[PDB]
Amino acid sequence: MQTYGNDTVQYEWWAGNARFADQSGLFIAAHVAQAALTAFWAGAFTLFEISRFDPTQAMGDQGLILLPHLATLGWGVGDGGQIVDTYPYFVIGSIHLIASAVLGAGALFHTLRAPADLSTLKGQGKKFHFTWENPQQLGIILGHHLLFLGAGALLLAGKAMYWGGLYDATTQTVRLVSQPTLDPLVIYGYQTHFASISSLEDLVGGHIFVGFLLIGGGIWHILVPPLGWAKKVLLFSGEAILSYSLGGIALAGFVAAYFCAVNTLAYPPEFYGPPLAIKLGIFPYFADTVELPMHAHTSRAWLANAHFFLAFFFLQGHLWHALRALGFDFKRVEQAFDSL
Amino acid sequence: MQTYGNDTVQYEWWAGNARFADQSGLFIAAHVAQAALTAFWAGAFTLFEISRFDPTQAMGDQGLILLPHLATLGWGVGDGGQIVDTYPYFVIGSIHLIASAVLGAGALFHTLRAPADLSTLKGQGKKFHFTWENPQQLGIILGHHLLFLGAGALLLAGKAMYWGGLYDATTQTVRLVSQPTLDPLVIYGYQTHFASISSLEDLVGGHIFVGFLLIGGGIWHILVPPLGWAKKVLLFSGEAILSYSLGGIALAGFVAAYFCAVNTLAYPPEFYGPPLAIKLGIFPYFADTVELPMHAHTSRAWLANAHFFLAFFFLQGHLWHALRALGFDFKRVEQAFDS
Amino acid sequence: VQYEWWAGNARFADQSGLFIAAHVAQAALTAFWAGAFTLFEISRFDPTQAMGDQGLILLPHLATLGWGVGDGGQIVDTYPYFVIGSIHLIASAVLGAGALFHTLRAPADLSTLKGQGKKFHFTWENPQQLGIILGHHLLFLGAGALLLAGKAMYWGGLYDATTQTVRLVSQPTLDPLVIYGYQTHFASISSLEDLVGGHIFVGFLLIGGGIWHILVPPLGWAKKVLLFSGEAILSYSLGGIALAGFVAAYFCAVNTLAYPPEFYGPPLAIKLGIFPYFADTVELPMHAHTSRAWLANAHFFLAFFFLQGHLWHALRALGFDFKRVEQAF
Numbered sequence A: 001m002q003t004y005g006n007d008t009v010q011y012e013w014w015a016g017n018a019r020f021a022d023q024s025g026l027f028i029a030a031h032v033a034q035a036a037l038t039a040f041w042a043g044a045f046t047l048f049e050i051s052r053f054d055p056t057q058a059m060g061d062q063g064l065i066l067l068p069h070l071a072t073l074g075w076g077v078g079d080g081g082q083i084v085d086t087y088p089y090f091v092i093g094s095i096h097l098i099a100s101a102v103l104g105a106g107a108l109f110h111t112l113r114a115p116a117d118l119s120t121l122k123g124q125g126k127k128f129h130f131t132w133e134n135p136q137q138l139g140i141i142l143g144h145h146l147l148f149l150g151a152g153a154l155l156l157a158g159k160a161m162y163w164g165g166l167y168d169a170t171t172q173t174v175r176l177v178s179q180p181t182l183d184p185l186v187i188y189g190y191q192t193h194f195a196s197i198s199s200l201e202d203l204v205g206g207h208i209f210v211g212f213l214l215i216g217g218g219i220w221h222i223l224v225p226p227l228g229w230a231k232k233v234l235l236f237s238g239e240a241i242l243s244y245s246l247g248g249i250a251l252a253g254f255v256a257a258y259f260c261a262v263n264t265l266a267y268p269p270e271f272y273g274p275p276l277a278i279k280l281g282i283f284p285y286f287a288d289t290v291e292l293p294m295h296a297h298t299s300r301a302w303l304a305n306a307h308f309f310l311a312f313f314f315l316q317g318h319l320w321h322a323l324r325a326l327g328f329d330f331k332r333v334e335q336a337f338d339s340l
Numbered sequence B: 001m002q003t004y005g006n007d008t009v010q011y012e013w014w015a016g017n018a019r020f021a022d023q024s025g026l027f028i029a030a031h032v033a034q035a036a037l038t039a040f041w042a043g044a045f046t047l048f049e050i051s052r053f054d055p056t057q058a059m060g061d062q063g064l065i066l067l068p069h070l071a072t073l074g075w076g077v078g079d080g081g082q083i084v085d086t087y088p089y090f091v092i093g094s095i096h097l098i099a100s101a102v103l104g105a106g107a108l109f110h111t112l113r114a115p116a117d118l119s120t121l122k123g124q125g126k127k128f129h130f131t132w133e134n135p136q137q138l139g140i141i142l143g144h145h146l147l148f149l150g151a152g153a154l155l156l157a158g159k160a161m162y163w164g165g166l167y168d169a170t171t172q173t174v175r176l177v178s179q180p181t182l183d184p185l186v187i188y189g190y191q192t193h194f195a196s197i198s199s200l201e202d203l204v205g206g207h208i209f210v211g212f213l214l215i216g217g218g219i220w221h222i223l224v225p226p227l228g229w230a231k232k233v234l235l236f237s238g239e240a241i242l243s244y245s246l247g248g249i250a251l252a253g254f255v256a257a258y259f260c261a262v263n264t265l266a267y268p269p270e271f272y273g274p275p276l277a278i279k280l281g282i283f284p285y286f287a288d289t290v291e292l293p294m295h296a297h298t299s300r301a302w303l304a305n306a307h308f309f310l311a312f313f314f315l316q317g318h319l320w321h322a323l324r325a326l327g328f329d330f331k332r333v334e335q336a337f338d339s
Numbered sequence C: 001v002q003y004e005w006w007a008g009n010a011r012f013a014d015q016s017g018l019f020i021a022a023h024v025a026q027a028a029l030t031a032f033w034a035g036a037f038t039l040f041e042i043s044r045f046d047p048t049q050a051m052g053d054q055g056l057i058l059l060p061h062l063a064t065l066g067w068g069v070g071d072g073g074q075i076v077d078t079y080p081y082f083v084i085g086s087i088h089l090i091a092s093a094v095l096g097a098g099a100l101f102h103t104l105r106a107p108a109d110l111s112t113l114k115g116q117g118k119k120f121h122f123t124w125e126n127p128q129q130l131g132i133i134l135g136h137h138l139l140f141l142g143a144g145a146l147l148l149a150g151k152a153m154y155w156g157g158l159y160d161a162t163t164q165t166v167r168l169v170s171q172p173t174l175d176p177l178v179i180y181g182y183q184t185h186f187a188s189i190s191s192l193e194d195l196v197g198g199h200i201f202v203g204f205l206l207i208g209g210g211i212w213h214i215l216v217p218p219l220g221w222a223k224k225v226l227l228f229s230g231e232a233i234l235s236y237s238l239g240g241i242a243l244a245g246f247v248a249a250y251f252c253a254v255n256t257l258a259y260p261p262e263f264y265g266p267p268l269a270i271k272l273g274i275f276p277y278f279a280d281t282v283e284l285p286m287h288a289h290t291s292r293a294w295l296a297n298a299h300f301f302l303a304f305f306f307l308q309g310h311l312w313h314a315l316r317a318l319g320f321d322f323k324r325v326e327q328a329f
């Protein structure tokens, strides 16, 4: 936390998650409980989407949110964009459900059996003890999360190359994509038309390039400690790293909301509905060209608008926490109105 | 119980059943009274169901639940899934009533004639007294229960192999199977596809295998105590062992609800109804494929959905007793919202 | 201790004369119901119709023995019912005579007598004289079993419902291994000759039990596994009579051999709604039932209520007077 003086600070219940921000074990426990909640939502809602799926209609009109996310990977897709056999969606939903179960079990284990601070441990638990002031352990955690995201990108790459086939909007069948792009100059040139790429080989080439970039960043962050040039320009607290991550996930949400509404192959038009139109009224939303009867919207509209609004409010959360990390009081803005 | 204040911690009447967690003389009376109520349900409710039975309609139509539980054992079913008499269901319910009567008598004995403690005797009861600190005696009680469960499994195998025939979904006849399964390779292969078996012989062979496995586990728990790493990893208390068993019975209830949902040979489709579909709305219910006239359900749904709910709430009871055994009092939650 | 007037018969626990008097008076009331209601519910009888439809309650038991019935199962007389009712009248007379003589004239404490009364006083802490009373009662019940055995040899034998004849039984079973295997074949033997053949074995068993109880007292373990108080001995007797009432309700439900089906009623059906009961296969419209359903249901409910009375006296005997007060703090 910030703690502009008053080192022994007490937070009330409406800021109740600020109480464990200094301790270590509850800091692990709350986050793995949150990951259990995300895995539970994923598995339980693709099961709920299998429960409320009709094969006599098109996909995106009935609010199909997760089954197009699995059909773009090409798991149970047939011919012409038709889904007749849904075994592996139920398989990955059950996998995510039991994964949420074991993650919640570990969360309650760290809340109950593991102590608050990991400095009282003796074996490997003392090596996992972290503080918001030393950047070395934070760099180790940073590099290992970099390595895990790179491993996830490599798993997606193997799903595109060896472990299965992806889906395209041209042939509307599965496709075993091999021999991707190997040139980084055209990847440097992809900063202008990244929204419409229209080729899956370029997609898996960009994915293996960003995956190898992530592995390089991971081994770089594990190998060298963080330097001194960034410690003079970046703040080192809980709310500072919270702010950097909040701005990162808000930018990622804006990027994903732009990617959802205009793409055609990473979001097929028969699975998510037609591509959208960026329409600014009061706020910039995404409207469909055709109008659904029961005031309804496609999955593309729901995904793009929800991710845009969540990215917007996460940007203001980054703003709140980043101004908090710079020393602002925030009753100073109430004292500025009260002095007036 | 965690013994917060001391061993004589107070309890109100909404938790008064925690008062005999350390007495170990009222434990016996409460448990065999629950066994008496279980046998009372098992007998009196099939006596209730034998009065409202219709021979023309299907058994999964009006809500017959216990009679399809006995019809798959081949007691009073004719050819093609039709019931020809009501006598063996009546005598099985009657002997369950007699077992309930003698177990309730033993319960009133153990709460009335037997003392509140069991270490206060001088005969065989001194060797029967248990408490929640020693691993070897509790392992002995566990091994005795494993021997009893394996004996029940071998009794089921003897019923299927020597005490008449059995119903199947292949020939639709009361069939006496023979030559059960020896190799565990198909038993290992059934671990990844346990929904459909397509063999009654492999079912009774797996039953003989798990029965012998339970006799072996009971003998192992009788002879040798826990080696020492269980005292380091696990816990040994009332609430901890209760939570272990609650998680076990919740997992058993989950897999039993799923086995009632998908399978169609252990539960015959002409007796319970058509095989259900796992429809997750606000909760996962195992819904029918046909529709009943006035808000009714088939008996397979009444089995599977109720056992799913009971497995869910027993999972949360396992969570409650696990947190109770791990030093959490649930009084820091009400104390973390003040000031 | 003191008992209120709403429940004050517990004073018979120490007074022995009233203990004899009230029970012999109760037996006089039973014999008065046996004699008087046979001679009073005879005007409801009509041999033109059936015996199961009118609701005759006593006379089925008299036609069970095979006194005034012949071929086809028809009643042509009343005079055997008259002589059995009349001996029940004079038996109730002499039994009530001894009853009120013990109530009014005999002393209460039998140990304060001089002749053959001081050797007749009983109490609740001895296994010897109570064993003598048990032996004499076992002798008399075995004598009643001997009378049932002699009914199949003296007056033409019992009545058979299968062959529709009052046949003389003269084939006793000389093997107790059939008696062992009867626990599956309860009320389904399809033979009337095997009932008397099972009655002579249990009759000689009753004589042997009475001889064992007269000759030797409880030799030591009955002082430990059992109690001798009045409430506990009442509990044991009520449990025995409740088991008897339940098995008699089962015999009135399922047998249709000892009870003739053309006289008592059709075979019954075991049902359960709120309480378990028995219902006829052929119902009657005027809110009436056969003697089978009436007897089986009433004996089932009375056996249940006397099982509850057995549990009440067992809780009263073993110190559980009022201990559920400590539920609420």
Ligand code: CLA
Residues within 6 Å of the ligand: A011, A013, A014, A015, A016, A017, A018, A021, A242, A246, A313, A314, A315, A316, A317, A318, A320
């Ligand atoms: C990375 C995510 C993240 C994390 C870890 C935190 C963490 C924290 N924030 Mg926070 N915040 C975030 C994102 C995040 N914030 C965003 C995106 C916003 C913008 C809206 C804010 C705005 C914000 C404010 C304004 C304040 C905090 C405060 C705090 C601190 C106290 C704990 C707390 O939140 O109270 C516990 C949380 C609650 C009691 C929840 C409040 C109940 C809300 C109103 C209901 C949820 C709204 C809605 C229904 C959500 C669903 C949306 C849609 C599906 C309908 C804690 C360190 C407080 C602080 O620094 O004081 C010490 C504080 O005053 N945050």
Ligand code: CLA
Residues within 6 Å of the ligand: B013, B014, B015, B016, B017, B018, B242, B246, B313, B314, B315, B316, B317, B318, B320, B324
């Ligand atoms: C094998 C199962 C088992 C056993 C032996 C116990 C044993 C115990 N539990 Mg328990 N529990 C269980 C399962 C079990 N629980 C499950 C599955 C849950 C989740 C719901 C709980 C939740 C729970 C709580 C929240 C608490 C206990 C407590 C206790 C202890 C005190 C006795 C008691 O319950 O109060 C005496 C019993 C009663 C008062 C009976 C109440 C019955 C209510 C009125 C039923 C309401 C109807 C309900 C909807 C169910 C309907 C079923 C439907 C089919 C009709 C005792 C050691 C308490 C404790 O730790 O001590 C303080 C406590 O606070 N338990």
Ligand code: CLA
Residues within 6 Å of the ligand: C003, C006, C007, C008, C009, C010, C234, C238, C305, C306, C307, C308, C309, C310, C312, C316
């Ligand atoms: C052979 C059978 C037998 C015997 C000898 C006894 C003997 C005794 N019982 Mg008893 N009891 C029995 C069977 C028996 N009971 C059965 C089967 C039940 C269950 C229904 C009970 C329930 C019972 C209770 C609940 C109590 C006794 C008590 C007593 C003792 C006090 C004296 C007495 O009877 O009060 C005489 C009492 C009355 C005559 C009742 C008053 C009048 C009522 C209101 C009328 C009867 C109600 C009934 C509905 C009428 C219609 C009859 C119906 C068949 C049509 C005495 C030792 C009491 C005790 O322990 O001592 C204080 C006591 O509290 N008994």
Ligand SMILES: CC1=C(/C=C/C(C)=C/C=C/C(C)=C/C=C/C=C(C)/C=C/C=C(C)/C=C/C2=C(C)CCCC2(C)C)C(C)(C)CCC1
Residues within 6 Å of the ligand: A029, A030, A033, A034, A036, A037, A040, A094, A097, A098, A100, A101, A104, A105, A107, A108, A111, B254, B258, B278, B284
């Ligand atoms: C708040 C809080 C917290 C947190 C926690 C959490 C948040 C949790 C979560 C957790 C979770 C979230 C969990 C999960 C679980 C899971 C489960 C419970 C599952 C189950 C399921 C099932 C069993 C299923 C089944 C099936 C299958 C498998 C298939 C077929 C069909 C069916 C569907 C039936 C803490 C403690 C830290 C602190 C305090 C407060």
Ligand SMILES: CC1=C(/C=C/C(C)=C/C=C/C(C)=C/C=C/C=C(C)/C=C/C=C(C)/C=C/C2=C(C)CCCC2(C)C)C(C)(C)CCC1
Residues within 6 Å of the ligand: A187, A190, A194, A197, A202, A203, A206, A207, A209, A210, A233
């Ligand atoms: C090709 C392609 C692709 C790929 C992509 C990629 C590969 C990307 C990358 C990306 C990246 C690679 C990005 C980056 C960016 C960055 C940023 C966004 C940053 C920001 C930040 C800032 C600006 C900060 C600053 C600072 C510092 C550094 C320190 C001092 C102070 C300050 C704070 C100021 C895809 C798949 C789509 C498809 C196909 C095509």
Ligand SMILES: CC1=C(/C=C/C(C)=C/C=C/C(C)=C/C=C/C=C(C)/C=C/C=C(C)/C=C/C2=C(C)CCCC2(C)C)C(C)(C)CCC1
Residues within 6 Å of the ligand: C179, C182, C194, C195, C196, C198, C199, C201, C202, C225
């Ligand atoms: C053949 C026949 C017959 C006959 C019958 C008889 C012969 C019967 C018998 C019966 C019997 C012969 C029975 C038995 C039973 C038994 C019981 C029922 C017992 C009980 C007991 C008790 C309850 C006791 C116990 C105890 C002891 C010992 C001690 C400890 C504790 C106690 C108390 C628990 C008739 C006529 C039908 C006809 C036809 C044929």
